[PDB]
DNA sequence: CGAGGTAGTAGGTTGT
DNA sequence: ATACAACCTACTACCTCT
């Protein structure tokens, strides 16, 4: 039978009970946060004798050497309280953190061709490497000629159980990061003016936009927010006078630059301040450098593990545990877990004369359900190029009819798909200017005056100064209950010329986003598990500090027959959802459903997008007050585990479906990926509480993720979830005020 | 803003 | 320099599409 597995290697010797110092922590005083205080009590106290190690378990911390040198703390005080061994029976958290501290250590002597250490070991769980690895393992370091050094980064998760084997779970990941300090940019005359930057010596925060440069030197005084203080005294007093003990009398005379954060303006050192590295400013900068690395940071699964083995062969034998090593192998299953590998059936969906043999052939079989005929359309295109409009609609019309490509042909796609309107002298077509938000608004209230328009299609223009208006466009037909198909330029400027066939992949996406922006339904599910009545799904999107907001989707049957959404009405300001929020949502949705199908569902299951956090004792009163059997499942998506599949000795992606299952708690891979460049990103999947079965959800779940009507690809995320975050990402552009059968924001 | 997914970067909100 | 862990959010490069 078919099996995978996750990214870990097992560990080989059994660990060996060993000695502590044995610390305990008692308050004097009051403190204002208790785990600040004791992580902050750990920090300084390991930082006082030569950087030992010190590890936390709960309000009690363990060393292994003698810390001789204990600073007085006014807010707590350090009791010695003897020396002691642990039983590694009850004590895995200890002694994982004392695994992680031992791989930092074997790791951190290693030195490559170049002179210097190939690791950056802080003794965390992340290790970053110097040098990447390539495809063929030339293990070559990797940095432009302006900074931009690139590097793989490990994260160490390591699990010791009550017995002494232990298993070394394993990720990776890339990180871009750069030398030159804003300081040498000065030097050099490279403007900086308005660069996103990061302060390297605090790690305080980011966001840190330069809002201008300063004229007064670091030398001078008060320049440092702190009053009286110069910038380069505020250093100097604080314990970390390392960072300027020893500066350049020009280092001195250097210009501060001050950065407005936030809202807030601050003043900052330039040689403590690295330009933050991002995609779009490697791009912007050094274009062929984003490309050279482009093939380097997706990492296909057997070069995930490639990566990873050198890394594990890099730590070798740990001398001071029992001869500690771990295997040159993953598991081949992970069944000695509970865990048990599978591949889901691929679901089966149904067009309106039967049973669909691809996704890129449903307009053969017909859309299961069509609205009624001749709904209206207009065209709204920008004064320079309409040519391009016209080109546009009558190409999308030629394919709702017989006649899809340049010439009329209906060797691949149907006839009279969908009834939609003409574009006759009705709602015409009329050309508006750019420049003005308030005439964008105001040419989509012109909109308004022609009768039954129907859903409408924009041409905006490519981005800079334009300020493009799908946002003020979406806005104002959001108001009235008007939908909208906004289209790009250059998809326009390709429509004009007959060189290729990739056309048809754009129209397929466009005309579902059209009947999906419509009540119209493309496909079904001809088997769903069943017991189910109706699917709901719910996500929070914040685009502010501080602001939540909710929203859901809602299917009325198993077999996804029709969509539905609610947007809340008002914020959160908070992920756990509001119990008011839940009243008003759970009240909309199923009153809606019991106008359209005539009272209450019988069992219905909900997807939480994050933690289920909410109050369960409430949807537990609500419901058995309705007499309403539910389920609750989260589906969490961005969860660092990868999952690899594991032939023999071959280790690929795992194929789209691909599930491991251990009670009320999987994984599964939504996606299809080639085994060629990269590797497929899974979901956590959890039953918090429920009566349905796990593989009937995770079925469900993976059905629902490929009923995706926007597009022929499958959605990673389910419909149910999906959606939700697609409202979320635009929330005011949706129609707040109830559910609505057709769909705006695909 | 054809669609969708992987990859960086940055910040937040919960519950131990 | 230092509160952690899990999970979110936002933005943007890239890349491909019977
Ligand atoms: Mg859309």
Same mark, same amino acid.
């Given at each position: ?78 009791? $010695?309280?003897?020396?002691?061994? $642990? ?15 031992? #791989? ?67 990720? %990776? ?115 062929? &450098? ?70 890129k052939q449903?307009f053969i ?19 320079? %190029? ?13 394919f709702?009819?017989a006649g899809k490509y340049?010439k009329?042909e209906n060797k691949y796609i149907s ?6 309107? &003409?574009?006759?002298?009705? %709602? ?73 066939k990739?056309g048809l992949?754009?129209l397929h ?118 007499? #309403? ?22 280790? %690929? ?94």
């Open positions: 039978a078919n099996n995978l597995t996750f990214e870990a290697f097992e560990g080989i010797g059994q660990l060996n009970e060993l000695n502590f110092y044995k610390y305990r922590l008692i308050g004097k005083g009051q403190i204002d946060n208790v785990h600040q205080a004791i992580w902050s009590v750990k920090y300084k106290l390991q930082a006082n004798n030569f950087f030992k190690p010190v590890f936390v378990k709960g309000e009690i911390l363990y060393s292994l050497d003698e810390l001789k040198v204990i600073p007085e703390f006014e807010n707590v005080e350090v009791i $010695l309280d003897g020396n002691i061994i $642990l039983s590694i029976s009850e004590n895995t958290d200890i002694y994982k953190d004392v695994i992680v501290f031992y #791989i930092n250590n074997a790791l951190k002597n290693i030195k490559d061709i170049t002179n210097y250490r190939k690791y950056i070991t802080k003794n965390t769980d992340e290790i970053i490497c110097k040098s990447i690895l390539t495809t063929n393992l030339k293990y070559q370091y990797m940095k432009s000629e302006k900074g931009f050094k690139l590097q793989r980064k490990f994260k160490i998760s390591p699990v010791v159980f009550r017995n002494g084997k232990v298993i070394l779970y394993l990720n %990776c990941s890339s990180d871009f990061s750069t030398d030159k300090s804003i300081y040498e940019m000065l030097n050099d005359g490279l403007g900086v003016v308005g660069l996103q930057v990061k302060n390297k010596w605090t790690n305080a925060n980011g966001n840190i936009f330069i809002e201008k440069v300063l004229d007064n030197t670091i030398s001078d005084p008060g320049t440092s927010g702190k009053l009286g203080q110069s910038l380069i005294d505020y250093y100097i007093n604080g314990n970390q006078k390392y960072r300027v003990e020893k500066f350049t009398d020009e280092d001195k005379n250097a210009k501060v630059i001050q950065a407005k954060i936030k809202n807030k303006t601050y003043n900052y050192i330039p040689q403590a301040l690295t330009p933050v590295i991002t995609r779009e400013y490697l791009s912007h900068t050094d274009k062929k &450098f984003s490309k050279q690395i482009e093939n380097v940071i997706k990492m296909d699964m057997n070069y995930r593990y490639q990566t990873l083995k050198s890394f594990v062969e890099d730590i070798g034998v740990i001398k001071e545990l029992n001869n500690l090593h771990f295997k040159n192998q993953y598991y081949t299953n992970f069944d000695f877990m509970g865990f048990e590998s599978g591949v889901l059936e691929e679901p089966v969906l149904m067009g309106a004369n039967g049973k669909i043999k691809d996704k449903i079989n017909g859309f299961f359900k069509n609205p009624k005929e001749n709904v209206k359309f207009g065209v709204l295109y920008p004064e320079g %190029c309409m040519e391009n409009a016209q080109s546009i609609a009558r190409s999308i019309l030629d709702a009819t340049n009329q006839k009279n798909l969908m009834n939609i309107g &003409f574009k006759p002298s009705e %709602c015409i077509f009329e050309s508006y200017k750019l420049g003005d938000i308030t005439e964008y608004k105001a040419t989509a209230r012109k909109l308004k005056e022609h009768e039954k328009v129907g859903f409408v299609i924009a041409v905006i223009p490519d981005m800079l100064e334009v300020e493009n208006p799908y946002n003020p466009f979406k806005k104002v037909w959001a108001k009235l209950n008007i939908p909208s198909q906004m289209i790009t330029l250059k998809t326009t400027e390709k429509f004009k010329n007959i060189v290729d990739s992949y754009y996406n466009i005309a579902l986003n059209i009947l999906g922006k419509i009540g119209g339904i493309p496909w079904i599910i001809k088997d769903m598990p069943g017991n189910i009545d109706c699917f709901i799904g719910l996500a929070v999107g914040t685009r502010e500090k501080g602001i939540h907001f909710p929203a859901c989707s809602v299917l009325f049957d198993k077999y996804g027959k029709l969509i539905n959404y609610y947007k809340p009405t008002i914020p959160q300001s908070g992920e756990k959802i509001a119990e008011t929020i839940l009243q008003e949502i759970f009240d909309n949705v199923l009153i809606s459903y019991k106008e359209e199908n005539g009272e209450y569902p019988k069992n219905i299951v909900i997807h939480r997008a994050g933690f289920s956090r909410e109050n369960i004792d409430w949807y537990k009163e609500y419901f058995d007050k309705k007499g #309403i059997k539910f389920n609750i499942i989260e589906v969490k998506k961005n969860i660092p585990v990868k999952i690899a599949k594991v032939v023999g000795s071959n280790i %690929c992606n795992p194929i789209k479906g691909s599930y491991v299952l251990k009670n009320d708690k999987a994984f599964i891979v939504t996606t299809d990926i080639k085994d060629g460049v990269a590797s497929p990103n899974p979901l956590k999947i959890e039953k918090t509480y429920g009566d349905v079965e796990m593989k009937s959800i995770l079925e469900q779940i993976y059905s629902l993720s490929q009923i995706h009507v926007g597009s022929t690809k499958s959605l990673r995320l389910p419909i149910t979830t999906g959606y939700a975050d697609k409202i979320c990402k635009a929330i005011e552009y949706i129609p707040q005020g109830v559910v609505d059968n057709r769909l705006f924001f695909l």
